[PDB]
């Protein structure tokens with residue numbers, strides 16, 4: 401893996417449940433059998449949406465966790481684990497959505513202003529999820545929902561492996577900047593979503609709080625604003641994305657804009673921890689979308705990410721570390737293109753997020769953005785997952801492998817692996833002062849024969865005079881590998897004479913000794 405390390409010893413594969421409730425797909429008996437089958441193919445747990453629209457449909461404090469409870473019961477009967485996603489967003493309307501579960505209708509009556517929803521550059525209103533600006537309403541509702549959920553699911557604490565929170569549209573921490581109705585669907589530029597009166601008002605106050613008075617504002621922005629009312633979000637999102645973002649106004653606007661999501665992250669992280677830490681004691685995470693289009697567009701750089709709220713990923717991730725939330729990213733199955741007209745760079749994006757997350761020490765999880773119908777995509781996921789220290793991978797979605805045996809088989813081999821620590825020993829290596837020995841092999845967990853970025857470093861043993869090291873490997877899979885020497889300058893000097901192999905890697909920890 402990167403930095404001479406191996407794969408993450410805690411890696412686990414999860415299966416995304418269907419969008420429709422199980423009873424709308426099959427019966428519980430078959431479901432339990434499907435779970436037992438998934439478990440046999442390497443899946444540790446099933447991740448599932450529990451919609452707010454279902455749990456608190458009738459009215460405030462009128463909860464119904466019966467479906468959730470019945471679901472967990474079958475997961476228990478099947479000896480599986482589950483990861484509930486407390487989906488406080490709407491189901492249906494997004495790409496590939498085969499459902500219709502809007503959030504409780506009554507929640508909208510809690511305000512007379514336009515503080516609860518979103519409004520785009522061109523006036524399009526969106527109600528897929530509560531506007532994170534309404535932190536007072538969010539604190540109350542999420543707070544009550546989370547605590548009610550914890551109590552209702554207490555009997556199933558043993559089958560809950562982790563809990564995922566919904567931070568916005570499609571359960572992702574972002575603004576609803578790419579939608580059909582707003583004319584911003586992939587792969588077009590996104591539209592800023594801060595045009596409600598309430599949003600304008602908050603930005604205005606934030607600016608004034610930062611500089612004190614209009615005069616200081618004008619001084620900092622180098623503008624000639626006539627009055628406080630002239631402080632507004634961009635009038636033209638396209639011109640703003642073309643070069644306005646470069647000005648001091650631009651930087652302030654984007655800071656505030658992304659800042660709303662960061663504060664939201666801290667808020668739900670606090671509520672979640674207060675509600676679950678004692679009862680469940682399981683990790684809590686949230687999702688970051690993979691807005692890969694318009695990434696390298698020369699005219700409107702990062703023209704899709706910025707409107708979505710993603711301007712500075714480093715700063716964004718700090719909010720996660722701060723809230724004590726693990727991160728779940730996507731687009732692990734895609735490769736870079738970067739050509740007109742999509743200017744898509746998903747892999748570069750993933751590499752960047754992973755690196756940042758690793759540096760900050762944030763537990764990293766991932767998913768595939770679109771359905772995978774070919775083995776090649778599994779390899780892409782494997783390459784990313786096993787070389788950038790991912791702790792978990794969730795496959796979307798259930799039916800794709802559950803009803804396709806050959807596909808399910810390719811996943812078991814490539815992704816449904818169980819990491820096991822093994823000792824690799826290499827004798828008689830003709831190393832000279834300055835050299836270091838690494839191993840690289842055929843599987844992604846071994847760098848896929850890469851000597852540049854992913855080789856796994858070994859350590860010299862001055863007592864037995866050989867090179868060794870404890871490496872994490874995929875249990876019960878066949879591997880081939882060879883050690884090689886790297887110069888002080890990083891040049892590959894030579895390779896082990898004969899290619900080694902382990903068919904397969906044993907399930908118990910032991911050692912593989914070979915000679916140069």
Ligand SMILES: OC[C@H]1O[C@H](O[C@H]2[C@H](O)[C@@H](O)[C@@H](O)O[C@@H]2CO)[C@H](O)[C@@H](O)[C@@H]1O
Pocket residue numbers: 621623625630631632633634635636639640641643644645647649650
């Ligand atoms: O709030 C000040 C001003 O902001 C916007 O104008 C920006 C523009 O969006 C940027 O692209 C760049 O040109 O800087 C401008 C500010 O000098 C709003 O369009 C405008 O209505 C508002 O007064």
Ligand SMILES: OC[C@H]1O[C@H](O[C@H]2[C@H](O)[C@@H](O)[C@@H](O)O[C@@H]2CO)[C@H](O)[C@@H](O)[C@@H]1O
Pocket residue numbers: 494495570572578585586688689690691692730731769770
């Ligand atoms: O639903 C949010 C979702 O949006 C994106 O998915 C894209 C997909 O990558 C494109 O190929 C095309 O199908 O449009 C989809 C929706 O616009 C992100 O890739 C994904 O990370 C994000 O969760």
Ligand SMILES: OC[C@H]1O[C@H](O[C@H]2[C@H](O)[C@@H](O)[C@@H](O)O[C@@H]2CO)[C@H](O)[C@@H](O)[C@@H]1O
Pocket residue numbers: 849882895896899
């Ligand atoms: O291209 C990857 C390749 O790596 C190994 O082959 C080495 C070989 O062991 C060295 O003696 C020398 O020939 O460099 C080769 C790499 O170009 C693996 O043995 C091979 O299976 C793998 O495809």
Ligand SMILES: OC[C@H]1O[C@H](O[C@H]2[C@H](O)[C@@H](O)[C@H](O)O[C@@H]2CO)[C@H](O)[C@@H](O)[C@@H]1O
Pocket residue numbers: 416417418419449485487489490491492494495496497570571572687730731767768769770796
């Ligand atoms: O059930 C999980 C969520 O699935 C959809 O959202 C996915 C989307 O299908 C995928 O293309 C994107 O890359 O990731 C999101 C987030 O997992 C539904 O639209 C969501 O409502 C569900 O929560």
Ligand SMILES: [Ca+2]
Pocket residue numbers: 460461540541544545
């Ligand atoms: Ca409530």
